[model samples]
Every structure is written in C-alpha cells, then in structure tokens.
Target: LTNSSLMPTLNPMIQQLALAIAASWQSLPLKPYQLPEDLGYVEGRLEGEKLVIENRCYQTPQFRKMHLELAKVGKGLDDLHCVMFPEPLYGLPLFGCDIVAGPGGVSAAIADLSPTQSDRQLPAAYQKSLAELGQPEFEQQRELPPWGEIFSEYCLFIRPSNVTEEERFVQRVVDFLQIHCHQSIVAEPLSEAQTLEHRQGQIHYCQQQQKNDKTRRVLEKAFGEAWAERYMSQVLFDVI
Candidate 1:
C-alpha cells in the first residue's frame, strides 16, 4: 500500500517509511489515545495550494501524550516530524524524528531521543537501546549546520543523495524512530516537580524553533508571514 506522487523521486519509499513508523508504534502495547475535539483537526494551505497535514496523539498511564504530524507542503515539501511529550509525571527524554525531502532527494533526516535535562550525554540506557537496534545501514553522515540546543549531540543528522541511498536513509529513520518509541515505553515516571520541569524544557524547545531562521523562512515562503507564525506556534511547534 503506497503512492507514487508522495515524493516523486522517492515516492513509495517515503510512504513505506511512514507506514513502518505507524506499524512500529501500534505494535507497542500502548495503543494511540484519542485527541481532544479542538486539537483534532487543522486544515490549511501553502500559498493557497492544498496542504495535507494530519496530527495524531496518544495517551496512556505511562505516556502523557504522543504527538505525530505528517506534513506535505503542496508541491514544495514533504516531511514527518514527531515529539513524544511525557506527562507531568515523567522525566523521559523527548522522543523525536524529523525527515525532510525534496525533488533532488532526501535533504535532511534526523532521529533521536533528546534529553530534557542539562547533561548532554544521553543516558546509559538510551545508548544501550540504540546499540541493540544497531547502527544505520548507510555510511555515517557528517553533520549539517547545527540545530542549536534543541537537538542533542546524540541525534543522527545525515544527507542521502540518490534513490538507493535515500531508501537506506529511510530505513534508518524508521529504526531510530522505533528505538525512541521503545525508550519512551519503558521510561520511569517522574514526580510532580520533575513533570513541570519537563514541560518547561519542551516549551523552551518550541520557542527556540519559533525563532529559528531556517524554519521561519521556509514557513514564511510557503505559507506567508501571518499564517506561518500561526502554524509554527499553533500547529507545528505549539508551545503554549
């Protein structure tokens, strides 16, 4: 079950990658939870061209909320970005995956469980977890321009040039996303104070993205000034 128009150059490959992520999440014992009515739907466009954006959220005793976004920027962009926001009662590192592609090929891909606290070194359990999942199939990719404090040193940032390479890159994205989901599932719950700290940490991340030039310019060009501001604040980042 795949579509050719999804990414033209990488069509069904990206579609398959997304499907794999969904399958992995569902395989976990924790099924997706229902989102609230108001948070359930959002529809918009980039320069008036139809943009298909879907948001899915989940809740459970262990997870406060898991948010997933599948965003296609009309003829301009196709990407998936997700963040698992632990309830106020847990201290789990925020789990995230970001994949952005273009007509040329896969331009950007990253997957990691970013630590909420100051120690940049990911926890031992996290390192062990990824080790069990094994390294990405492709040759290690060099870093791109830094993503600031929001992305930890632990993240996998890479550029894959062709269809074959992009397929391998997509596989690794699925693998890392699976690893992050497993980490979130097994994490220890936090205390009241710790939960609040995690919330603030996430908020700080959103604010940082809001001020980021790359994302800002992208959204502005695709959706215009006012709409971009709202999308970044309300739909994409949603700090408040």
Candidate 2:
C-alpha cells in the first residue's frame, strides 16, 4: 500500500511530487520515527473551509531529521513543505522543498539544498556537483522573499506556468534531493568546533524561515496567532 492514501484529496501535481520525495527519503536507507501524536496528522477548519495537515518524519545515520508536511485548505489552496536537518556533526547543508498551489495553478514552488554554515556556502562536495549538474530553467521564475537569504545560490523559486512547468519543478527538486542523499553517505564528520558552528547555523536558519509574515497571517486567520506561533516554532522549524 502506498502512503498516498493519507491525503486523498490533495492536488494531483503536488501529490505526485510529495510522494516522489517520500519515496526518495525511503530509498536513502530510511528509518521511520515518531513525532508528537498530534503532529502526525490533524484536521482543522479555516472559517468554513476544511484544512488538513499530514506529516511524516524519518532519520538515517547521517541525517538527524527529515520531516515532510502536506496540507490543504478546502480546494482553494495546497501546500507542501519539507526539510532535512543533517546531524550537525556531518557538516552538511540543509535540504528543503516547498510548494503552494491554488485555484489558478501552482503559484509558488521553491526548492533548495541550503547552507547551514557561518560562511553561508555549501560544502565542497555539494558545491562541485551542483555546478556540474548546473540548473534547469523555468519560464515563470519568481523572486525569493526578503527572508529568503537562508537559501543557497542554487536555490530556485518559481511559479510554474503550466502543467509541464509543474512537473519540471518537481523533477528538479527530485534531482536536488537525490544529490543530497548521495552526499550524505560520503560525508565525514566535522571537527568538534565545526560541529558546534553547524548547530548554531541551524538555529539561524529556523529563525529566518519563521519570519515569513504572509505564512503567519494565514495561520493566524485560520488557526489563530497563538496556535500558529506554536505550530511554526514547535513543528515546522523547531530547532531542537
């Protein structure tokens, strides 16, 4: 049985990509793990609009946490957010993916294997491969918001112009994801000092992402600012 059943009403384009990532994680020598019971899957309502959030988390020896979150607000909006937190000891960059789809089409699709380093540059292994892999072009490329500095030079934020563009976005993310997995296996543990730096850098990353006012506004409207604060801090980017 595929895990796709968890969100039966999810947008087809988003559904395909989310599943692709879930599968990619599994093939990375994955091991399923527990999250708080309430965070696993939950239901809510935004006024009369139904809201559903489903999450799964996994870990491997090198990566401490890989969390995937999918949500929908009635038929008007669809969301996907994922992040992979390396064990810090490994000195690897963070991995992230996000997509927001609506009545018109996929409005925002952003993907990155971001840096979690003081210099804000990807590791040597990642830097070389990413350059050789180069980048794929998208017609409706969009600008990153002001707080988007956490993303690396390789990051791509876009608005897919058509179904074709939608799939292309998904493919690039998959390509990026697979590379992260490959890098993890060969990565050597960092020195104690570097490990501490990585830990601090991760904190900075979460702080930057939690500053998105637009996401906060929607959550406050739908789930109230109090719950939104808790969700964003505790689940979405919880440093610990």
Candidate 3:
C-alpha cells in the first residue's frame, strides 16, 4: 500500500499545492532527469504512521535541476518542497517553495526567488517583475529564518488561515514562478570569472537550509540520520 504512489487521504491543501507546482514547472518545458537510486519514492513509518516521499526531477538549459518532493505521514503531517537551481553561469535567482499542513489548516507556507549575487538582491529583471506585482497580502506573516538573507524582497512567508487564504497563496506562487521560469530561460550567461560569485552563493543557500532542525528531526525520526543526511545533502538542497 505504501508505494511511490500518493496516499489518497493526504490533506487537500497539500494535494493542491503539489498540483499547482507541477503545473508551473511544466512551463519550464523540462527534460527528464533521474534521482539517486531508491530516492525517487521512499516509504517509512513515523510513530507508527505511514510515511511516504515522492520525488521528480527535470533539467533545462538554464536550470541544472528542478526538484519536486512531496511527503505525507498519515493524517498528521503533509508537506511540499520544491527547488529550481539555475545554471551557475547565469545570474538567475533560486526558486523555492515549502508548505506545511496539519489537520486544522496550513500552518506555514513560503515561496521566494532568492538571489545568489554578492548584493543579495534579485536581478534587475526579477526585481522589476516583483515590484510590478506589488506586495501580496496574507493574514499572518511568518518571519524568515535566521539564515533567510538569501530570500529576495518578494519572499512570502505566512500562515494560511483557511481554504481562501491557502488558494490565495497558491495563486501567488504561480505568478512568482511564471516570472522566474520565463526570465531564467531568457537570461544571458556570464563568463567563468564573473560567474564565480554564484558558486559560493548557491552553496551558502544549501548550507543554511540544511540547518532547518525541524525538517532534519522529522526525517531522522522516520528514516534515520544517515538517510536524512543523504536526502538533505543530495536530494532536497544539494549544492551542485
């Protein structure tokens, strides 16, 4: 029963979030890419409740890897995570989203196109696109983590109050993603010397995300520390 297939009983919000993200990435017009063995779909038991992780990966000329990972543990926890790592030679911002859901409602949702430049700001194209969108309004704003400087000015972190708010967040993500994907493909690539800066910036992004203790603990409990480390280092936020 606990195969790579999604559990039908997962939170509707989570399912919707996954569908929206999947739809958005299709615009990138991806090419199939393989993940590490057995990492594509993992099954474990967390506190006696079934745990399932489903992953899909793709690549394009501008982005090295576009990873989609969704996890659900019985009825208690449902989460969605996505990251689109750009080709280091271009000055593209990182695209990422995370949603955490519970029985009552969605507890946290975040989406951003983070810059990997020394200025710690999105590229002019992204900044202008984001500015044109103005600011998205949410009921409760969740503060960024301590290592959140990578996030661009338009980062959205909030607690979605209900179906209305949840859908609002979903639509907002599509807007941000559309801008990012189209911009990325059209971006010009820089020379080796100029692109060196992006190396450290992208690496730093993964380093900070790995510090998410809550995500680490959850994986550790379900799949042990080694698997968690591998998943974190190689799957979710791997540096290159």
Candidate 4:
C-alpha cells in the first residue's frame, strides 16, 4: 500500500497477500524481531521510479526464523517473497515463495518446500499434499545456471502471458503459500544431529543466493553497491 498510483497499474495483490500471511501467524506463539531503525523499512527511487520495500521477521516454536518482504518497483511491478526456516530442532523442509508480477504479466513465480539437508527429501505426506494441490498451467521454466537442482521436485516456476492468466497465477501462488503455512504449523521438531544438518543446509542456501542471486543487480540499481550488499545480506538472504 505504498503511495498508490492510478488504477490498472497498482498492485493490491501484495497487500492482500501480506495481510493474509500476517493473520495466519497471528494466533501462533510468534515473537517479532526488533530490527534497527535504519533497517526496519525502506523506500526510495529505482530507475527514476518510486520503489518501496518493507519486511517483517518473526520466530516461533517450530520456526527458527521467518522473513517476509513486499517490494514494489515503479507503478507496474510487485514482488512478495518469503522464507521460513524450521528451528534447528526440526528437519522440516524449508518453505519459500517468490512471486513477481507486472503490468505485462507474471514475469516469474516460484513456490516450493526445499529439502533442508542433502540426504533428506520433502516428506512423503508433504509431497502428497503438493501433488493433490497440483501444478500450474504455465510452461516449465529453465534457468541457464540450472538453479532448479536445489529446488524441490514439486517446485512451480512460471511466466503468465495474459491478464487472465496472471490472475490465475496469483491465485495458485497464494494457495501454495497457504499450504506451506499449514505445513509449518503442523511440523514436528527433529533430532539434535538432524538439527545440526538443517542449520548447515540453511547456511548453504544463503551462501548460494549470495553468490548467484538474480536480484543483486536490481538491488544495486535501487541502492548503491554498499547499501545493496548490506540489504541483500541482512535482509534478503539473512544467513544466520
């Protein structure tokens, strides 16, 4: 809801998604992270277009850390990204969603429950849930670097061409988000040894993003190099 522009180009999708996610976790024993003044929320210009960014971080009994970000670029594009790491005590798969949309259409969308450890796979029950929920209609996407290897088998990466298709894409992303949330709520903690492995896995994931993230350039374009690095490290990847 940052400085709404005219009608067609504005994105209320981000607001609605953020609100729904917050409401879902409200009743849980969640503890909010108190960030420093400068890092709490940010707003600026990117490519001479108004850019707005905000994030919320929380910790729960089952979730060691959860981060949600709403980023709006210009008047046409909106991105809602989230990462939920299960407490080291749980071997639950890492839950994530990256949905980016623009007036042209949904440029990129990814949703999946990635395995926390190399030896582990998403639980069979979760796999069944994903299968039942089903995949989207968009054609399968491929990355030049083959980042797909790190994602779950059930991952959905899509690009929608038309307005009607964009709407459906958003709905599908939201549904998968809800599925991830519910799975996090019901997840059980893991063994001490498994927890250690999970922590290492989380670190590795962040490290990979640090080295090869596609958003690095966008962040640099908005903020200077130093600030972008800080934002990417402290906010986006958050490898701790």
Question: Total clashing residue pairs per candidate?
Answer: 4, 0, 0, 2
Which of 1 and 2 is ahead in lDDT?
Answer: 2
Expressed as tens digits, the lDDT of each residue in 112-195 for candidate 2 is: 998888998998888998888766778988888888989999998998888788888777888888888888888888999999
* Residue runs of model 2 more than 4 Å from their true location after superposition: 1-6, 46-48
State the local distance difference test value for candidate 4. Answer: 0.69
Model 4 residue runs over 4 Å out of place are 1-16, 36-38, 45-47, 139-145
Best model per TM-score: 2
Total residue pair clashes for candidate 2 = 0
Pairs of colliding residues, candidate 2: none
- State the lDDT of candidate 3 residue by residue for 1-240, as single tens digits: 234377466577767767777777766668987877735788886566766888888988888888888888777888888898888888788889988887877888998899888878788888898898877778799899898877878889999877788888888888888898789768888988758888778999999999898898778888888988998888888876
Ranking by lDDT: 2, 3, 4, 1
Residue 164 lDDT in candidate 4? 59
Candidates 1 and 3 compared by TM-score, better number: 3
Model 4: per-residue Cα lDDT at residue 73: 74
TM-score of each: 0.76, 0.93, 0.92, 0.82
Q: Model 4, poorest ten-residue lDDT window? A: 1-10
Score each candidate by Cα lDDT: 0.64, 0.82, 0.81, 0.69
- Model 3: how far residue 74 lies from native, Å: 2.4
TM-score of 4: 0.82
Better of 3 and 4 by TM-score: 3
